[PDB]
Amino acid sequence: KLPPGPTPLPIIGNMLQIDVKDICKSFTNFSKVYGPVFTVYFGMNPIVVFHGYEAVKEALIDNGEEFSGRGNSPISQRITKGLGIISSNGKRWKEIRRFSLTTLRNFGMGKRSIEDRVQEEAHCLVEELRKTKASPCDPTFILGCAPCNVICSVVFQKRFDYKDQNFLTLMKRFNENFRILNSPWIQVCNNFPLLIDCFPGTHNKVLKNVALTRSYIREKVKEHQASLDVNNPRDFIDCFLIKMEQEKDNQKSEFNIENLVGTVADLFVAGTETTSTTLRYGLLLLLKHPEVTAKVQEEIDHVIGRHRSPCMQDRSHMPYTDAVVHEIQRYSDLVPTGVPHAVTTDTKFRNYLIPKGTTIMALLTSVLHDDKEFPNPNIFDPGHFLDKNGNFKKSDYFMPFSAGKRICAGEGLARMELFLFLTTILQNFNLKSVDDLKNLNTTAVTKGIVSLPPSYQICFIPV
Numbered sequence: 001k002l003p004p005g006p007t008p009l010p011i012i013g014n015m016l017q018i019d020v021k022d023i024c025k026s027f028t029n030f031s032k033v034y035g036p037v038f039t040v041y042f043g044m045n046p047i048v049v050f051h052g053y054e055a056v057k058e059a060l061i062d063n064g065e066e067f068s069g070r071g072n073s074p075i076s077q078r079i080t081k082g083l084g085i086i087s088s089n090g091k092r093w094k095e096i097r098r099f100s101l102t103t104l105r106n107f108g109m110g111k112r113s114i115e116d117r118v119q120e121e122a123h124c125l126v127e128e129l130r131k132t133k134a135s136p137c138d139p140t141f142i143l144g145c146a147p148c149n150v151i152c153s154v155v156f157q158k159r160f161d162y163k164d165q166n167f168l169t170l171m172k173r174f175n176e177n178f179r180i181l182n183s184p185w186i187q188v189c190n191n192f193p194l195l196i197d198c199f200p201g202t203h204n205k206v207l208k209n210v211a212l213t214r215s216y217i218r219e220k221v222k223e224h225q226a227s228l229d230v231n232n233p234r235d236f237i238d239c240f241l242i243k244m245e246q247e248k249d250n251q252k253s254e255f256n257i258e259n260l261v262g263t264v265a266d267l268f269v270a271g272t273e274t275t276s277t278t279l280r281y282g283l284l285l286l287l288k289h290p291e292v293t294a295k296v297q298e299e300i301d302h303v304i305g306r307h308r309s310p311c312m313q314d315r316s317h318m319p320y321t322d323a324v325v326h327e328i329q330r331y332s333d334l335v336p337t338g339v340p341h342a343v344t345t346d347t348k349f350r351n352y353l354i355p356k357g358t359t360i361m362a363l364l365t366s367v368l369h370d371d372k373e374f375p376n377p378n379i380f381d382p383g384h385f386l387d388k389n390g391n392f393k394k395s396d397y398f399m400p401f402s403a404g405k406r407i408c409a410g411e412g413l414a415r416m417e418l419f420l421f422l423t424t425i426l427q428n429f430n431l432k433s434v435d436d437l438k439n440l441n442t443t444a445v446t447k448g449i450v451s452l453p454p455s456y457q458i459c460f461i462p463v
């Protein structure tokens, strides 16, 4: 039996009781009428929503294996064709994921640590910021390049020069699909597959954007094979190629070319625009909160100095900086509804039964914005992650990366990118606004699955 919920009108479902824009405000309202777990209908498709720490925890952690599905829609299945990590399921998923996770360990790619790659990029990021000569600017693009190049460095064993035309079309391609797939219209075309017919241009752009990206990665994969020194791998590409080698027999093992390309594109789709939006939302909060930025700057000076680049080891000695990054991700609420999951078999959830393959929506926003764990959860305040002695206070409610079996495969890489970029940036500049701070609003715009920070101009003042 499915959990209770609003009464569905026949073919459209609950689609009229939901605010397609702030779709998370609607769910929150239902929880007030139907409790922790409830069910809504997107057309003829059922979606069971889990709202609250208890529910979210129970579902993703405790009954994890059953909820370690993943959500797939008409569109995404068409794009990825079931390959990779994000979209794949079952034996394909576990097989790929595990390899990816080990390869994505700081020293899981060879002699050159992932950290070293980020650091190089942190320096490069800083240099481009110098070139703005302290003039006002929109950090969207520049900040965007850093993360995307990180994945590039991690996937192709060499960063791109911010001006390489190959780096730019590739990056603007991922930024396009992201932008499109983050449109509320995809949330209506997935539940009504006929509407795809009304967007031939958009539809065409996405398919052409996917074709050229895959097609590019293929060539890129081949030029790594013809220079493959199996003794010591260079990057994620070599590592996967070596794995494919010992599958000479297997011929079902998911370690083939078709999965390689797909898994790579997944590192780009999941690890680029996400970090980008957070560094973006991060600077904006640091800009709006000078006192906070000072203290971070005060810790950087003490623990790191004004000469060496910041590294991950400094984090354990910079409690306040840790809490700023944490509070950045929390406030940020990047993915409010989390990514859609699905149950592996018919599952029982406290008095209810969810048939194998039902769409699962764990509400991350509800955990992160918990009234008691973080008093006054709507205001930015690093104190949510600090104890009365200024020490870092870890939270079980810290779920910006989701929880359970399907937790972000790049959690390490993401937190690394956020800490290193932001600290290095603050180490070299001060943040001046193109107006008063009181004229600066940090309220997000959630016109989609990924909430975005508002457009803003910032001045990087080195001192």
Ligand code: HEM
Pocket (backbone or CB within 6 Å): 070, 085, 086, 087, 097, 104, 266, 267, 270, 271, 272, 274, 275, 278, 334, 335, 338, 339, 341, 400, 401, 402, 403, 406, 407, 408, 409, 410, 411, 413, 414, 415, 418
């Ligand atoms: C601030 C940065 C990031 C945030 C907030 C974030 C968040 C998330 C979230 C919420 C999910 C879905 C988890 C679920 O199933 O419920 C996810 C999945 C994933 N992320 Fe990230 N992510 C970030 C960065 C990255 C980076 C840099 C990479 C690159 C390696 C990455 C790779 C992935 C992958 C591969 C998945 C799919 C995992 C699976 O289905 O098994 N993420 N991320």
Ligand SMILES: CCCCCCCCCCCCCCCC(=O)O
Pocket (backbone or CB within 6 Å): 198, 199, 200, 201, 202, 203
């Ligand atoms: C100042 C004028 C701005 C123009 C505003 C235009 C608003 C209508 C836009 C309609 C866009 C149609 C999108 C079609 C996409 C597709 O074919 O896939």
